[PDB]
């Protein structure tokens, strides 16, 4: 069934749960709406099930009917969602016609957060940051620490200045 898929995956292993320290669970099934592994939130127990995903910048509304349970390849049934957030919400509400207010809303929600993450462009236009992360490998953090101690020692700056002071102020009098 499903009520027999759930209670098996629910306890007795849904090999893609993350136990937060919090206690909270997280179905990492790249398809669910709420990241949390919960009945009527896991795309595995529940048989009617929608979501938004992105692919490129293209945000699709994937839907999973229970007709298609026979045939796991043509399981999801996606739709490009316009890209004016205003029409897009209306776009969404159209398809959700007569589903659980859960999806009906939690999808509107996903849709938003994913859209308000087209704020990568906001990081990538106002980039030009003269910083960039550098890895410190602990080999280097020796060759470049134990070799200075040796340079200093082999330098002996005093005897060098002593030279290039006397040797200066013997030809600049």
């Amino acid at each position: 069934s499903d009520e027999i898929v759930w209670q098996v995956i629910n306890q007795s292993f849904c090999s893609h749960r993350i136990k937060a320290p919090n206690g909270q669970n997280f179905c990492r099934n790249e398809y669910n709406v709420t990241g949390l592994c919960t009945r009527q939130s896991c795309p595995l127990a529940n048989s009617k099930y929608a979501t938004v995903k992105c692919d490129n910048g293209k945000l699709y509304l994937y839907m999973k009917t229970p007709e298609r349970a026979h045939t796991p390849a043509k399981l999801w049934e996606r739709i490009k969602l316009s890209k004016n957030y205003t029409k897009a919400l209306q776009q969404i509400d159209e398809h959700l016609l007569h589903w659980s207010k859960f999806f009906r809303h939690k999808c509107k929600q996903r849709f938003t957060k994913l859209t308000q993450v087209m704020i990568t462009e906001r990081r990538l236009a106002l980039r030009e940051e003269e910083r960039h992360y550098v890895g410190v490998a602990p080999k280097v953090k020796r060759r470049e620490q134990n070799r200075e101690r040796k340079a200093l020692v082999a330098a002996k700056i005093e005897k060098a200045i002593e030279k290039e002071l006397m040797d200066r102020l013997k030809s600049g009098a």
Partner: protein, 385 residues
């Protein structure tokens, strides 16, 4: 072998005379027979593009605004024949520095933003040349019967221009582009008085972030025109280009105004330059100019330069083929060339000339010049006893 090495910090030409296997970095190894400075015209006037014509005749172009023609003469000094250099005539004042200092209201980065020549190449045995500038100016310079140069016609293009490349596959034309100044096709007249823009490129549809994909084509070559049914209205011109923005792009005009394949060669959109056609077996596949003599894109292979130290090889599908002298080059590379199709002439800012065999990917000659090289040309590869 013999080389003409364009210098900048002295502002000159260094003549390189050596063998194959010569190295200025190992003392027990072979030392080059001669290295001589010629025409030390200063840091304010260095040579941008050269052209070799024949045995005792070469034409240059300086960053003062000048285009010089030089007679070469050989004499003796075991048993080696060095060269003397004498300027016959010079065509001066060809830059328009003011057109640049007005356009770049921060385009990317150059505070002084000096104008140079992008090309110095023949047009068609003709005694006729074309010199193009980043300011947009194209100068048609002809060598007179009295061995004295004369400017024929000055023509203008929509600046800035980072390259210009003619078309010599008869089966007059050229294509040009620069920063945010797309690829455009220009047919020119036999009088050289008239230019006409037959075709303009269209940039590709946006990426994931719906931002406009930057257009900044750094170099272009041509490929022999498409086979098949030639459509009326559309022109037949196959030509690949490279951008700063790691796009190796490939346009067939017959297909359409956008390129059929925009391909990111590297991650992060790394800065790229110079589109050098070479063949995998160390053969010649290209014109005297440098366009690829083939009807298909897939036979094409390209050596390119980055702004770090890395000189890459690619195919006509973006698959990375191998770094050239990954070890020995340490500074940036300014100038790469596929001489005879069986040698490479690389020398950037680390101030060494490097001659590379194409087939085994192996350094032949390493010559310290002491100046930042901005150009090299081979003259001969005949050994000295």
């Amino acid at each position: 072998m013999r080389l003409l090495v364009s210098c900048v910090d002295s502002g000159s030409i260094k003549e390189v005379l050596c063998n194959i296997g010569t190295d200025t970095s190992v003392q027990s190894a072979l030392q080059p027979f001669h290295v001589a400075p010629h025409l030390a015209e200063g840091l304010k006037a260095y040579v941008d593009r050269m052209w070799v014509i024949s045995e005792d005749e070469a034409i240059l172009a300086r960053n003062s605004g000048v285009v010089e023609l030089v007679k070469i003469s050989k004499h003796l000094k075991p048993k080696f024949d060095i060269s003397e250099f004498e300027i016959t005539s010079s065509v001066s004042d060809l830059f328009d520095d003011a057109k640049l200092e007005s356009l770049s209201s921060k385009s990317v980065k150059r505070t002084k933003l000096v104008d140079g020549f992008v090309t110095l190449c023949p047009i068609k045995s003709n005694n006729t040349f074309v010199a193009a500038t980043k300011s947009g100016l194209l100068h048609i310079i002809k060598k007179g019967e009295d061995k004295k140069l004369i400017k024929l016609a000055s023509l203008g293009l929509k600046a800035p221009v980072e390259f210009l490349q003619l078309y010599d596959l008869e089966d007059y034309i050229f294509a040009y582009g620069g920063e945010e100044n797309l690829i455009k096709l220009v047919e020119i007249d036999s009088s050289f008085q008239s230019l006409k823009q037959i075709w303009e490129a269209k940039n590709v549809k946006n990426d994931r972030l719906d931002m406009r994909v930057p257009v900044w084509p750094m170099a272009l070559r041509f490929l022999e025109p498409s086979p098949g049914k030639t459509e009326k209205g559309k022109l037949n011109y196959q030509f690949a280009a490279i951008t700063r923005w790691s796009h190796l792009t490939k346009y067939s005009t017959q297909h359409g105004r956008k390129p059929f394949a925009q391909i990111d060669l590297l991650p992060n959109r790394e800065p790229l330059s110079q589109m050098e056609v070479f063949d995998a077996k160390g053969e010649n596949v290209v014109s005297s100019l440098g366009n690829f003599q083939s009807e298909t894109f897939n036979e094409l292979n390209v050596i390119t330069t980055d702004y770090k130290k890395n000189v890459f090889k690619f195919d006509g599908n973006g698959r990375m083929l191998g770094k050239v002298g990954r070890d020995d080059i340490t500074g940036s590379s300014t100038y790469i060339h596929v001489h005879d199709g069986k040698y490479l002439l690389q020398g950037g800012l680390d101030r060494y000339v490097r001659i590379f065999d194409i087939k085994t990917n192996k350094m032949l000659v390493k010559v310290y010049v002491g100046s930042r090289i901005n150009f090299i040309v081979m003259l001969d590869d005949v050994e000295i006893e």
